[PDB]
Amino acid sequence: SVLQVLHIPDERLRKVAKPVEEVNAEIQRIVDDMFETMYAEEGIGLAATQVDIHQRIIVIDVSENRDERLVLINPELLEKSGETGIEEGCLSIPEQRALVPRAEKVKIRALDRDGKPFELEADGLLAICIQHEMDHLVGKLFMDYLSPLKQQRIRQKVEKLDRLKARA
Ligand code: NI
């Protein structure tokens, strides 16, 4: 099932997620529907909290033909180094992109879809993507990194967009 993605300025985007207590079949259905929603919305990553589920689950897939789907449950940042930034988009901030400071490399520890633990050293797009999604889980958005004026300037935009969007 395709889940509905919340947009700013929805207050539920600012909720802190709780860790997953047990990775079971309800968890695994959330994963499936999250992947479905991400692909439908043409993203390369989705955090559970953008879909009003306030648990620590992230799905990513950067692959061309769904060969390499990635699942981080209860993710934890072990180390980072460097600094970079591309012009990020966010499914919850529709059509708005900004360059954002990130660590260039990142080492994490998480659980997979089966609740088995793994480690992952990432760089490039993957590293930036992990940070972006992990931010979602503590209620941070990429626009939080920008100046009051850019944020202000941004917010105006999106509300109009959706104000078109329901359209009716
Ligand atoms: Ni996002």
Q: How far is the CA of 120 from the centre of ligand 1 (A)?
A: 21
Residue pair 57/68 in contact (Cβ under 8 Å)? The answer is: no
Resolution in angstroms for this experimental structure? 2.1
Residue pair 131/105 in contact (Cβ under 8 Å)? The answer is: no
Residue type, 109: R
* CATH number for the domain that contains residue 109: 3.90.45.10
Q: How far is the CA of 21 from the centre of ligand 1 (A)?
A: 24
Q: How far is the CA of 155 from the centre of ligand 1 (A)?
A: 15
The answer to whether the annotation marks 54 as part of a ligand binding site is no
Please, is 52 exposed, middle or buried when counting C-beta atoms within 10 Å of its C-beta (0-12, 13-18, 19+)? Answer: middle
Catalytic choice (22, 36, 88, 133): 133
| Domain count of the fold of the chain | 1
| Segments forming the whole domain that contains residue 118 | 1-168
Residue pair 75/130 in contact (Cβ under 8 Å)? The answer is: yes
For ligand 1, a single-atom ion, the residues with CB < 5 A are 90
The string of DSSP codes covering 37-80 is HHHHTT-SEEEGGGGT--BSEEEEE--SSSS-EEEEEEEEEEEE
Measured torsion, CA atoms of residues 26, 69, 137, 55, in degrees rounded to the nearest 10 = 10
Distances (CA, A) of 151 to 9, 95, 97, 102, 139: 11, 14, 11, 18, 16
Question: How far apart, in whole angstroms, are the C-alpha atoms of residue 68 and residue 70?
Answer: 6
The answer to whether the annotation marks 129 as part of a ligand binding site is no
Q: How far is the CA of 92 from the centre of ligand 1 (A)?
A: 6
Cis peptide before 101 (omega within 30 of 0): no
Active site residue 121: no
The answer to whether the annotation marks 132 as part of a ligand binding site is yes
Q: Which residues contact 90 (CB under 8 A, 6 or more apart)?
A: 96, 132, 141, 142, 143
